[PDB]
Amino acid sequence: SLGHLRIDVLNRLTYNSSSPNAVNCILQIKMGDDAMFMVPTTSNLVMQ
Amino acid sequence: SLGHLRIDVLNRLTYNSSSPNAVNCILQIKMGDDAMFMVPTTSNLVMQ
Amino acid sequence: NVEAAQGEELATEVGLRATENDGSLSEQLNMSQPMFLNFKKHKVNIYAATHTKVDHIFGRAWAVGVFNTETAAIQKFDLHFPTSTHGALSRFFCHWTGELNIHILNVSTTNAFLKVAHTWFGTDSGIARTATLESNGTMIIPPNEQMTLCVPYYSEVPLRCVKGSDRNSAGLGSLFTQAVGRTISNRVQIFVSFRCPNFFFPLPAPREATSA
Amino acid sequence: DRVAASTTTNAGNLVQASVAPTMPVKPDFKNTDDFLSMSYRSTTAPTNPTKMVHLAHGTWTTNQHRQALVASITLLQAFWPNQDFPAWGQSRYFAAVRCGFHIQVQLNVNIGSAGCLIAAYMPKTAHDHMNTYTFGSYTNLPHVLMNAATTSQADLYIPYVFNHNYARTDSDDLGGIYIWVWSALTVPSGSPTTVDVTIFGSLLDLDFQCPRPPGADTVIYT
Amino acid sequence: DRVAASTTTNAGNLVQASVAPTMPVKPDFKNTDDFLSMSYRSTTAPTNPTKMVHLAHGTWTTNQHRQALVASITLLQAFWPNQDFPAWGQSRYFAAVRCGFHIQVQLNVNIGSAGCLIAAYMPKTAHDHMNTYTFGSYTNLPHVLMNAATTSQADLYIPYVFNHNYARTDSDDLGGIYIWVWSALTVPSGSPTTVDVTIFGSLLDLDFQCPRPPGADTVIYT
Incomplete structure (x- = not known):
């Protein structure tokens, strides 16, 4: 495991009458600047 | 006739709860930069 | 203006040409082909x-003939110019002179050496010169192996003609082989590739022969 | 009385026994009209097919979940499906297209709604199969994200990208822009539910080649 | 997030809350293709309507006397009466024509026949009435005489000549070329009687203006 990331509330969402009740969010992992990969190897998966 | 101008919807008006349902619009014809007029002439109209 | 163009002198360039005056046939090669306002x-x-x-x-070789040889007796194998392949592109020319490669491919179930020798003159030079092929340029080929040996041009006819089948001057050669080492079912396959060919004079494009 | 040749565009004329041409007395062949009865620039006519046009609007509502498809545009067949479009008449002759593409996605969201549509670009040979692609990865494509709030317009320029050198007009060969739901919209009450989406396109770097009969199809690359 | 305007040809786009555009990695927008898969010049497409086209052939026989009419062409409506002609598709949009004209009268007479046709040019407001004109004087017009013997082709260039500044496409406004019998032909026997006449036209100094709906007519000068 690469480790947990936890997302918690500091301040609850404050919704207005003209405003939505709850919002939908998305996480994305972008690989870094310096990231190397090494020593190519086969795997059992198919089509990838 | 000087020709039609048509005004149509690309995207319907999106109204909010704090926002009006429908808006009132106005067309104005401004005469151009270079527009000349020519050869003055009387007409049958009155007061104009 | 931009679109239109006019004569009357350059109508030669716009494609009007008198076929009755061709100059030399090679003079037509110099001719500038016609073009309209837009072509690049x-x-x-x-x-x-x-x-x-x-x-x-003609660097790419082509396959002429396949035969198994179970007998040590000297094998007469005659080489015609190529048919039914990209070698048939050479069918435009009669006169041809240049040295040609021969790629022979030896296949032996039982271990056998096989020998290759080439003679531009046929079996008969007026005497039977086929008595032993050792002295005529033999090059020995190991079993299950192949070699690129090329034959120099030795002929009493300075220019071979492609078309004719006449054994004297027409063919591009006649090939001799024999197995050694007491074997059978030694099978060969032989490939012929030209090297820096010189083709002289053209001929019309030959008819496909359905009736042979 | 000599040989006179005449060539314009594709056509050409080789005449024998020609006669010298005639023109009215004191002719003036200068094209433009000064003074001008038209304010337009005389390069209008050939330029005209490049004009930007409304393309394939779609309606994106609450109910549609993620990975759903709001609207679809087949790129190269999009600019002249009908006779009404400006680039149609001149594309009804020439059979090939080298043209580049400019597409500006128009969108309007009433302030107080939240969600995203994604405008991507999928070339034909890619478009052949949707089933292969993970959804979470579509951002690898040339694209632009569109936030509900604080985005009026999304401007993306697409260079010509396709297998074959030239592409057939009447076909789908350039592939097309497909607009996907990145996240559901969230509507407070009361609000209009349907958020209308209009893909307002354009075209640039115009090219045509390889003449054909007006209505007939012709194969080129295959 | 600022105001972004976009203008191409006639259309224009004024956007608020714009987003910076995107392009594929290492884009190359150069239009032309090198190496070339097409030998043609890329200026072909806009130039194409200028291409010279067969126009309204006619049959001139023995029986027809002098002052008779061999064939008739209404000039401006001549280049796109049908959908087949090259200049049609692009003239089906723009409603006005400033264009000049190039018409080359093609004719072939079997050696040993004698007679003449005259190729004249009559503008519209002239064409309104034939009845006024003496025949013997038609040579005042821009024209070319055509001898049976020793004339292959007759090349005449017509500059734009008309009352109004611009002329309507779909109408006859430019008038037209009318070909008349200057003297009867004389045929020895045996010979083919009918001598076929084909007016092989063209167009130059192309111009168009004043956009309209594709199929609808519009008045301008009247």
Whole structure:
């Protein structure tokens, strides 16, 4: 495991009458600047 | 006739709860930069 | 203006040409082909090398003949110019002179050496010169192996003609082989590739023969 | 009385026994009209097919979940499906297209709604199969994200990208822009539910080649 | 997030809350293709309507006397009466024509026949009435005489000549070329009687203006 990331509330969402009740969010992992990969190897998966 | 101008919807008006349902619009014809007029002439109209 | 163009002198360029005066046939090669207002003639080389050049095209070899040899007796095998392959592109020319490669491919279930020798003159030079092929340029080929040996041009006819089948001057050669080492079912396959050919004079494009 | 040749565009004329041409007395062949009865620039006519046009609007509502498709545009067949479009008449002759593409996605969201549509670009040979692609990875494509709030317009320029050198007009060969739901919209009450989406396109770097009969199809690359 | 305007040809786009555009990695927007898959010049497409076209052939026989009419062409409506002609598709949009004209009268007479046709040019407001004109005087017009013997082709260039500044496409406004019998032909026997006449036209100094709906007519000068 690469480790947990936890997302918690500091301040609850404050919704207005003209405003939505709850919002939908998305996480994305972008690989870094310096990231190397090494020593190519086969795997059992198919089509990838 | 000087020709039609048509005004149509690309995207319907999106109204909010704090926002009006429908808006009132106005067309104005401004005469151009270079527009000349020519050869003055009387007409049958009155007061104009 | 931009679109239109006019004569009356350059109507030669717009494609009007009198076939009755051709000059030399090679003079037509110099002729500038006609063009309208919009065409762009540009020579675009996609490959560095040219497949069109005589030197390159006949570099690719082609397969003439297959036979198994179970007998040590000297094998007469005659080489015609290529038919039914890209070698048939050479069918435009009669007179041909140049040295030619021979790729022979030895297949032996039981271990056998096989020998290759080439003679431009046929079996009969007026005497039977086939008594032993050792002295005529023999090159020995190991079992399950192949070699690229090329034959120099030795002929009493300075120019071979492609078309004719006449054994004297027409063919591009006649090939001799014999197995050694007390074997059978020694099977060979032989490939003929030209090297820096010189083709002289053209002929019309030959008819496909359905009736042979 | 000599040989006179005449060539315009594709056509050409080789005449024998020609006669010298005639023109009215004191002719003036200068094209433009000065003074001008038209304010337009005389390069209008050939330029005209490049004009930007409304393309394939779609309606994106609450109910549609993620990975759903709002609207679809087949790129190269999009600019002249009908006779009404400006680039149609001149594309009804020439059979090939080298043209580049400019597409500006128009969108309007009433302030107080939240969600995203994604405008991507999928070339034909890619478009052949949707089933292969993970959804979470579509951002690898040339694209632009569109936030509900604070985005009026999304401007993306697409260079010509396709297998074959030239592409057939009447076909789908350039592939097309597909607009996907990145996240559901969230509507407070009361609000209009349907958020209308209009893909307002354009075209640039115009090219045509390889003449054909007006109505007939012709194969080129295959 | 600022105001972004976009203008191409006639259309224009004024956007608020714009987003910076996107392009594929290492884009190359150069239009032309090198190496070339097409030998044609890329200016072909806009130039194409200028291409010279067969126009309204006619049959001139023995029986027809002098002052008779061999064939008739209504000039401006001549280049796109049908959908087949090259200049049609692009003239089906723009409603006005400033264009000049190039018409080359093609004719072939079997050696040993004698007679003449005259190729004249009559503008519209002239064409309204034939009845006024003496025949013997038609040579005042811009024209070319055509001898049976020793004339292959007759080349005449017509500059734009008309009352109004611009002329309507779909109408006859430019008038037209009318070909008349200057003297009867004389045929020895045996010979083919009918001598076929084909007016092989063209167009130059192309111009168009004043956009309209594709199929609808519009008044301008009247």
